Design a protein around this ligand. Structure first.
Ligand SMILES: Nc1nc2c(ncn2[C@@H]2O[C@H](COP(=O)(O)OP(=O)(O)NP(=O)(O)O)[C@@H](O)[C@H]2O)c(=O)[nH]1
Ligand SMILES: NS(=O)(=O)c1ccc(Oc2ccccc2)cc1
Ligand SMILES: [Mg+2]
Ligand code: NA
Lengths: 469, 167, 166
């Protein structure tokens, strides 16, 4: 038969499942809704583990339970009472014999030890992957240290001693590849000559590589804490989502730099060279699976100042028109082809973050926090699982590093790019549009001629890499 | 066969803009949504006896990608310009959204509606007369909507489709 | 994208977690933090086909030995890991093999035998002894180093191929 349980009067997690406290979706069950007690029971269930439930729960629980209250509840879960001796044990003891204690031993082995281990696994994952709760609440960390540091008994000892050390490490807190990264490529600008660095003087291969390293690092830095609760859209977004905002602002700045390079090149022939070079950079972004970079270029070419430059587009080689058009097709029909391509490539890659943001926001706005059933309010956990499926996808692409060498000067050049200067956004984007009107006036105004501005060769070195011995 | 209308929702972030399209496309009578689902933003409707397909682009959450707005906007035939009735800044933003739409579409007469959205019970700061006066100065309709009761939601989208049909 | 459920099993301290984290993050973990249960996902193209690996990293400490049936039921393939400088961990392999076969009620479960820590000179399990055992199970034997990455992709992606041909 099943093991008997402690009385639900002394141990709240032994209350029977009912539709008043847990609802399952239609071989482990999937939870649609439940009380916080039932969610924690199933998070630490004696019969199994959904390995992904711990991540889902720890990513999303603050929408329904405060960190201090979660710690109290899992400590309560951990402290399981042992059953009293059975009749057979009683009779043995009355005869001076040692009891077999069969039911007690089974309850320890099959209920207490698995539940306690799974509570400790929640603690371990909490400290390792969601440590911000403890960075933001020193007293929460004290409580966790005291709880772990006072667990007695040999069955849990290895993990208790380990978690104590992990916490101490986290308080005061290296990549290997088989192959070597390719050689850094140089064009007109030579190593160390940062004052000559520019769109046409750096090698287009190396522009794309160094931007991919930068954009990959920015992508990898975004934590789920910056996303859950849609906090990057709220009044405190600069406090709660700083890595996400840095990532987006880099993307916006690079897009605007591409636009500025184009429309400030008033000579038509030179501007064709600029646009062609940016499409070559897009080709290398595609080869590197840097989809953020791909869309940085596509966004620039579809901006109002650039898109209208018909005389420039006419002179772009047909093969490059095709590269740009196929890149743009990734975004069509609500990113249908982008989503399929992302799911088909071999990482490393840099996803476009914007789709994830819209899907997290709409999942949070479009589903209720609670479900009302039989007069009770149950936490709508299905909504939280949907959010954590998105944050899980984000994290999956954050794991794989690029096998590319950093060039510190080129990296600094792109980190310090500031096309808007001290201008405000509207002032600057109106400036770009007025430059577009200057260099290619609206019909029927005639097309003017403009002097060259570049003193160095405009011929591209191309985007196929070179390899000396 | 039936006409497809490409509609674009624009407006300030952080103030409940996404509720407009969610409430339209939703199972009207079950409060649920999965935005990742292929065609969670397409809806067949009958407007003035004529069946059509609405394709709605709402990039809510991507407001900080400001250099992508031009490309997103150019996809649209008609625009819902949304502000929150308890957020005066979102109302003051409307002028620049409309100017940007006109530039991107290269037209002084783009089908559009002004939508004032009640996203919570916080106090209204934009009176309906202010928004009506703004919409009249632009020559466009004004619709007010609730982010919670679905009131006004159909009217906002159907009014925009009528603006497209009568352009 | 086909999804594959892989499970990494073996005695405590043989390097199951280090192998998994090297595969997932290209990083070698120096610490020995005993696992309770961890899970990872990896999108990767193998033999020209994109798939999604769900990798379960399990507990090797004996104190968790009564909690294995739950993960053996759901796993599709098993990396059976021992350390080549730890003869006891090699002797523990057959206990994992027999339990997996019992739980899945099958003589034909996708498996790979993994001899880890092959960067260390002081070997105590000879390759021939491990290869003989692998042949008796009908499975490949791959020596790995989570520290240097030697054999790591080969071990995991060989297991994927065995699930794909199952
Ligand atoms: N030299 C060397 N050390 C390794 C290798 N793999 C793991 N180690 C080391 O061996 C120790 C145990 O590794 P770990 O991955 O934690 O082992 P585990 O099998 O996951 N342990 P558990 O079953 O308790 O969870 C760590 O100190 C780790 O650095 C390897 O290939 N070479
Ligand atoms: N929709 S698209 O991405 O294929 C696209 C096509 C032509 C464009 O025009 C131009 C492209 C380059 C320079 C000047 C003008 C812009 C974008
Ligand atoms: Mg481990
Ligand atoms: Na206000």
């Amino acid at each position: 038969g099943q093991m008997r349980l402690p009385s639900a009067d002394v141990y709240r997690f032994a209350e029977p499942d009912s539709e008043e406290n847990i609802i399952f979706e239609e071989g482990i069950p999937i939870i649609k809704a439940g009380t916080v007690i039932k969610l924690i029971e199933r998070l630490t269930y004696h019969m199994y583990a959904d390995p992904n439930f711990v991540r889902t729960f720890l990513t999303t629980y603050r929408s329904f339970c405060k960190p201090q209250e979660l710690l109290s509840l899992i400590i309560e879960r951990f402290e399981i009472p042992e059953p009293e001796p059975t009749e057979a044990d009683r009779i043995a003891i009355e005869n001076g014999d040692q009891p077999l204690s069969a039911e007690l031993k089974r309850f320890r082995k099959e209920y207490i030890q698995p539940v306690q281990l799974r509570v400790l696994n929640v603690c371990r994952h909490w400290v390792e992957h969601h440590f911000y709760d403890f960075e933001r609440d020193a007293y929460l960390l004290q409580r966790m240290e005291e709880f772990i540091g006072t667990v007695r008994g040999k069955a849990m000892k290895k993990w208790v001693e380990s978690i104590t050390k992990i916490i101490q490490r986290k308080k005061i807190a290296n990549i290997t590849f088989q192959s070597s990264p390719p050689t850094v490529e140089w064009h007109i600008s030579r190593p160390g000559h940062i004052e000559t660095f520019d769109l046409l003087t750096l090698h287009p291969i190396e522009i794309a590589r160094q931007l991919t390293l930068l954009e990959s690092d920015l992508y990898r830095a975004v934590q789920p804490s910056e996303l859950v609760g849609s906090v990057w859209t709220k009044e405190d977004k600069e406090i709660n989502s700083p890595n996400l905002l840095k990532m987006i602002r880099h993307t916006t700045n690079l897009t605007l730099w591409f636009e500025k390079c184009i429309v400030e090149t008033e000579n038509l022939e030179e501007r064709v060279a600029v646009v062609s070079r940016i499409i070559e950079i897009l080709q290398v972004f595609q080869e590197l699976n840097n989809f953020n970079g791909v869309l940085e270029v596509v966004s620039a070419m579809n901006s109002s100042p650039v898109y209208r430059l018909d005389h420039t587009f006419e002179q772009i080689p047909s093969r490059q028109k095709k590269i740009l058009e196929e890149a743009h097709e990734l975004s069509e029909d609500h990113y249908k082809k982008y989503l399929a391509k992302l799911r088909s490539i071999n990482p490393p890659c840099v996803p476009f973050f914007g789709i994830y943001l819209t899907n997290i926001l709409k999942t949070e706005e479009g589903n209720p926090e609670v479900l009302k059933r039989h007069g009770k309010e149950l936490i709508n956990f299905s909504k939280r699982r949907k959010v954590a499926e998105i944050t899980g996808e984000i994290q999956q692409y954050q794991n794989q590093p690029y096998c590319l060498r950093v060039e510190s000067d080129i990296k600094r050049f792109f980190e310090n790019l500031n096309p808007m200067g001290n201008s405000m956004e509207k002032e600057f984007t109106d400036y770009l549009f007025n430059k577009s009107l200057e260099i290619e006036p609206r019909n029927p105004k005639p097309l003017p001629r403009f002097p060259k501005k570049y003193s160095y060769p405009l011929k591209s070195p191309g985007v196929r890499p070179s390899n000396p011995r | 066969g039936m006409t497809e209308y490409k509609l674009v929702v624009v407006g300030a972030g952080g103030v409940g803009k996404s509720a407009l399209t969610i409430q339209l496309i939703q199972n009207h009578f079950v409060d649920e949504y999965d935005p990742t689902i292929e065609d969670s933003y397409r809806k067949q409707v009958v407007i003035d006896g004529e069946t059509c397909l609405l394709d709605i682009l709402d990039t809510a959450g991507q407001e900080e990608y400001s250099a992508m707005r031009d490309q997103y906007m150019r996809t649209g035939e008609g625009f819902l310009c949304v502000f929150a009735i308890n957020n005066t800044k979102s109302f003051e933003d409307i002028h620049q959204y409309r100017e940007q739409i006109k530039r991107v579409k290269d037209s002084d007469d783009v089908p559009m509606v002004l939508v004032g959205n009640k996203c919570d019970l916080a106090a209204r700061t934009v009176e309906s007369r202010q928004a009506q006066d703004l919409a009249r100065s632009y020559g466009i309709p004004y619709i007010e909507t609730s982010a919670k009761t679905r009131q006004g939601v159909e009217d906002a989208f159907y009014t925009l489709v009528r603006e497209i049909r009568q352009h």
